[PDB]
């Protein structure tokens, strides 16, 4: 029986604790079991003897992952759909400094989150910045673009060039 687990920070516990009933329900339509350990502080999903397509566990592995990094449930469970893809991009190991990482991340989201939104509208993806991760959700190509933009942004490459390039690409597709 296949099984995947993930750890979640304490400040998320509460939220998960009140939405978990939905989670299992959403998982129950695939006969996938799930357990919220409040001692270990972890979420775990696993297959059963009644799982029709075991492959879906991979999707179920993504779900809780997204849940662990503050992705809202109604947005998170879309991963169970066949077409949806996801990508958790770690951004903590690009900068040795502390408050430089803050600067560059800030530049990734930008003023009023605008640039982020722009990114979201050009790659056609959901994006959420949280702590040392950037959780992305959508089409594979768009996810590749998001990963390029984010990773380059953490290496002190300004996202304006990427946004302009994506803009031109969007305009060429008409």
């Amino acid at each position: 029986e296949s099984s995947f687990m993930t750890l979640f920070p304490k400040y998320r516990e509460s939220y998960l604790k009140t939405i978990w009933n939905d989670v299992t329900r959403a998982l129950d339509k695939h006969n996938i079991a799930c357990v919220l350990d409040l001692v270990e502080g972890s979420m775990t999903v696993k297959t059963t003897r009644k799982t029709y397509d075991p492959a879906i566990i991979l999707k179920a592995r993504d779900l809780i992952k997204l849940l662990a990094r503050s992705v809202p449930f109604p947005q998170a469970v879309k991963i169970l759909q066949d077409d949806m893809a996801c990508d958790v991009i770690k951004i903590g190991n690009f900068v040795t400094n502390k408050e430089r990482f803050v600067k560059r991340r800030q530049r990734l989201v930008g003023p009023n989150g605008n640039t982020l939104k722009a990114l979201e509208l050009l790659t056609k993806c959901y994006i959420l910045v949280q702590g040392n991760t950037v959780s992305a959700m959508g089409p594979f190509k768009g996810l590749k673009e998001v990963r390029r933009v984010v990773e380059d942004c953490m290496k002190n490459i300004h996202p304006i060039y990427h946004i302009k390039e994506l803009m031109i690409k969007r305009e060429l597709a008409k």
């Binding site: 530049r107 003023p111 640039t115 300004h158 304006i160 803009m167």
Partner: peptide, 20 residues
């Protein structure tokens, strides 16, 4: 030095303003 990034922030801001 870091006037490049500060310039690009304003530039990106205005560009986003002038596109939507």
């Amino acid at each position: 030095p870091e006037a490049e990034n500060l310039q690009n922030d304003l530039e990106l801001q205005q560009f986003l303003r002038e596109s939507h």
